[PDB]
């Protein structure tokens, strides 16, 4: 597939909606790293993703639990998710950075 | 191969059974991360998966050992398991979250 | 796609694990995923080794992971495939140490 | 596809440009690890990559947050990016090292 | 699918590792999996580097991992493939540091 860089920043009041325009193209979001930004203090941060499960209902899943003094970056190794996907902070002020690839076949 | 989002929550008194209707061989659970929940205490948490070995018997294996002050998240990198699978906390009260993909072959 | 079965074992000082497959027409691989310390392990260094054949036709020993409860209780290997036979053991530390992975069989 | 080793060192005010090559081959940069170098201090380091998004515009993303006393190395597992790519330290003085593979389809 | 053999080496301030082959280098890949501090390693910074050919055809040195016993004694590289010849060495620290991985061989 074609491969484009993806990223976003999450905050307590800022989520991210990944949606792709309808067309003759199949899209995947492949998540790589979740990293705490400066401004996360030392509070617990939990990042969640919401998208469709196999049985056709939205589910919310926890991608990572981070804390600056313990584990500031988690590497997901290319966690692919079919859009639409919402990414949000379940707790923590943020910022939390997300990186990955937007794959198009 | 279609790809759907998967996750579950585990607690001391709550496991998770991943099962599929008919063609178990066309389905794979691909585990990504095991994460401690908000509200988990700082005790040792150990997560276990139970599924079939080649010899045809269920076996119990340890997926991850976590502790809030040391390692609150473990990334498994797409550990595929053929259903049925049971996921449970062997140790700790949780909540512990698991995320991954439910992959379906065509 | 190969068939995929679950694999795991527990290691202790003086308790290793021999993974071997019976003869057949198929190709087998052991794909190692995680190494994790178990409850009650001493908070000391644990070193896990794997033994299997090298390219030159001799069994060799390699270190898969170094773990310690208060620092790094789990290491994820990401699917380290090894052709059987494989012997897994603790080179040091009390254990218990758990290993998980997949037994892949291509027909 | 041919496989070549790639690496760079980043510092404050010292970034890296992985440039479109002057050939008609297909190229990918696949990032493997980001690691703090000797002499890096214990401040937060944030490493960023800039490259083209799906819509055609350049974007800046965070690859890793590192701190010597907590997490001196992050493994990305083969994060492929299409050139051109700029790698830089957003925060921290470094040195920070990046390693990976230059993949070429000829 | 390539033949898949086990690979490992030990590094020390004392000792590096040269991975080389006598036949066609392009049929071989070293796929690195883990870098781990050994028993006997102290708590100083350890930095492991690899040296191998870049696209332009000259040798380049890269850092594979930075380890410290009290912080991060093992780094998993997830199958970092390199074409021989390759040299692995400690740039910093006295070790021992162990490396494990796969030696992959293309079948003609
Ligand atoms: Co919203
Ligand atoms: Co049950
Ligand atoms: Co034995
Ligand atoms: Co510049
Ligand atoms: Co030498």
Curated annotation (Swiss-Prot), chain A:
Using the record's annotations, give every residue carrying the modification Phosphoserine.
Answer: 30, 57
Record-marked site positions (Interaction between pentamers) = 42, 67
Localization (cell): Nucleus, Nucleolus; Nucleus, Nucleoplasm; Cytoplasm, Cytoskeleton, Microtubule organizing center, Centrosome
Post-translational modifications: Acetylated at C-terminal lysine residues, thereby increasing affinity to histones.
Distribution of this protein across tissues and organs: Expressed in B-cells that have been induced to switch to various Ig isotypes.
Where is the PTM Phosphothreonine found along the chain?
Answer: 62, 82
Give the start-end ranges of region Necessary for interaction with APEX1. Answer: 1-104
Family assignment from sequence similarity: Belongs to the nucleoplasmin family.
User: Which residues of the whole protein does the chain here span?
Assistant: 14 to 118 of 292
Q: What exactly does this protein do?
A: Involved in diverse cellular processes such as ribosome biogenesis, centrosome duplication, protein chaperoning, histone assembly, cell proliferation, and regulation of tumor suppressors p53/TP53 and ARF. Binds ribosome presumably to drive ribosome nuclear export. Associated with nucleolar ribonucleoprotein structures and bind single-stranded nucleic acids. Acts as a chaperonin for the core histones H3, H2B and H4. Stimulates APEX1 endonuclease activity on apurinic/apyrimidinic (AP) double-stranded DNA but inhibits APEX1 endonuclease activity on AP single-stranded RNA.
Provide the protein name: Nucleophosmin
Phosphotyrosine carried by residues: 54
Q: Which organism is it from?
A: Mus musculus
According to the record's subunit comment, the protein's assembly and interactions are: Decamer formed by two pentameric rings associated in a head-to-head fashion. Disulfide-linked dimers under certain conditions. Interacts with NSUN2 and SENP3. The SWAP complex consists of NPM1, NCL, PARP1 and SWAP70. Interacts with the methylated form of RPS10. Interacts (via N-terminal domain) with APEX1; the interaction is RNA-dependent and decreases peroxide-damaged cells. Interacts with NEK2. Interacts with ROCK2 and BRCA2. Interacts with RPGR. Interacts with CENPW. Interacts with EIF2AK2/PKR. Interacts with DDX31; this interaction prevents interaction between NPM1 and HDM2.
Position of the Glycyl lysine isopeptide (Lys-Gly) (interchain with G-Cter in SUMO1) cross-link: 19
Q: Where is this cross-link: Glycyl lysine isopeptide (Lys-Gly) (interchain with G-Cter in SUMO2)?
A: 14, 19
Modification type N6-acetyllysine: residues: 19
Curated annotation (Swiss-Prot), chain C:
Q: How is it modified after translation?
A: Acetylated at C-terminal lysine residues, thereby increasing affinity to histones. ADP-ribosylated.
Species the sequence originates in:
Mus musculus (Mouse)
In this chain, the stretch annotated as Necessary for interaction with APEX1 covers 1-105
Q: Where in the cell is it found?
A: Nucleus, Nucleolus; Nucleus, Nucleoplasm; Cytoplasm, Cytoskeleton, Microtubule organizing center, Centrosome
Found in which tissues?
Expressed in B-cells that have been induced to switch to various Ig isotypes.
Function of the molecule: Involved in diverse cellular processes such as ribosome biogenesis, centrosome duplication, protein chaperoning, histone assembly, cell proliferation, and regulation of tumor suppressors p53/TP53 and ARF. Binds ribosome presumably to drive ribosome nuclear export. Associated with nucleolar ribonucleoprotein structures and bind single-stranded nucleic acids. Acts as a chaperonin for the core histones H3, H2B and H4. Stimulates APEX1 endonuclease activity on apurinic/apyrimidinic (AP) double-stranded DNA but inhibits APEX1 endonuclease activity on AP single-stranded RNA.
Q: Where is this cross-link: Glycyl lysine isopeptide (Lys-Gly) (interchain with G-Cter in SUMO1)?
A: 20
How is the subunit organization of this protein annotated in UniProt?
Decamer formed by two pentameric rings associated in a head-to-head fashion. Disulfide-linked dimers under certain conditions. Interacts with NSUN2 and SENP3. The SWAP complex consists of NPM1, NCL, PARP1 and SWAP70. Interacts with the methylated form of RPS10. Interacts (via N-terminal domain) with APEX1; the interaction is RNA-dependent and decreases peroxide-damaged cells. Interacts with NEK2. Interacts with ROCK2 and BRCA2. Interacts with RPGR. Interacts with CENPW. Interacts with EIF2AK2/PKR. Interacts with DDX31; this interaction prevents interaction between NPM1 and HDM2.
- Write down which residues bear the modification named Phosphoserine: 31, 58
Q: Which residues carry this modification: Phosphothreonine?
A: 63, 83
Instruction: Give the family, as the similarity comment puts it.
Output: Belongs to the nucleoplasmin family.
Protein name in UniProt: Nucleophosmin
Superkingdom of this protein's organism: Eukaryota
